[PDB]
Design a protein around this nucleic acid. Sequence first.
RNA 1: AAGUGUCUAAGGGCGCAUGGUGGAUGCCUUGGCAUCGAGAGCCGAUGAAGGACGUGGGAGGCUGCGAUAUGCCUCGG
Length: 68
Amino acid sequence: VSPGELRELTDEELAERLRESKEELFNLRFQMATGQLNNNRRLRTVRQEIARIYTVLRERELGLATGP
RNA sequence: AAGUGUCUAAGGGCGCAUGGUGGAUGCCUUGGCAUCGAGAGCCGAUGAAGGACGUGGGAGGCUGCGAUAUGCCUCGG
Ligand SMILES: [Mg+2]
Ligand SMILES: [Mg+2]
Ligand SMILES: [Mg+2]
Ligand SMILES: [Mg+2]
Ligand SMILES: [Mg+2]
Ligand SMILES: [Mg+2]
């Protein structure tokens, strides 16, 4: 996901997509452990996306770029 | 019969030849030392200096970072 395209998410579906990012990092972690995923770049990407969501969520309630 | 009369190397010495060991010498250098000219002269309870433990697809160290973890966002190049 991109910082710009995760701006149209207003206030709660942004947290809900943070939740599914956490869930998919979970499952991708599990397939790392069991060796059943081929592209291991995916958890780097997902971790970065979780960081992106957390960052944007922090800016919105610190007082920057808020809006639905 | 009397007599003179070489030669031998178990090993060793000396000199060569040919190797080994070793890391001197020479020539270097992502390291130092001494300065000069400019800067900046403080950091910390808004938690410092410095660390521990973690963090990467692969084990460890360094280095970076802090569960947002070799990373997140924005503005520039
Ligand atoms: Mg030398
Ligand atoms: Mg002062
Ligand atoms: Mg390494
Ligand atoms: Mg390492
Ligand atoms: Mg946190
Ligand atoms: Mg840019």
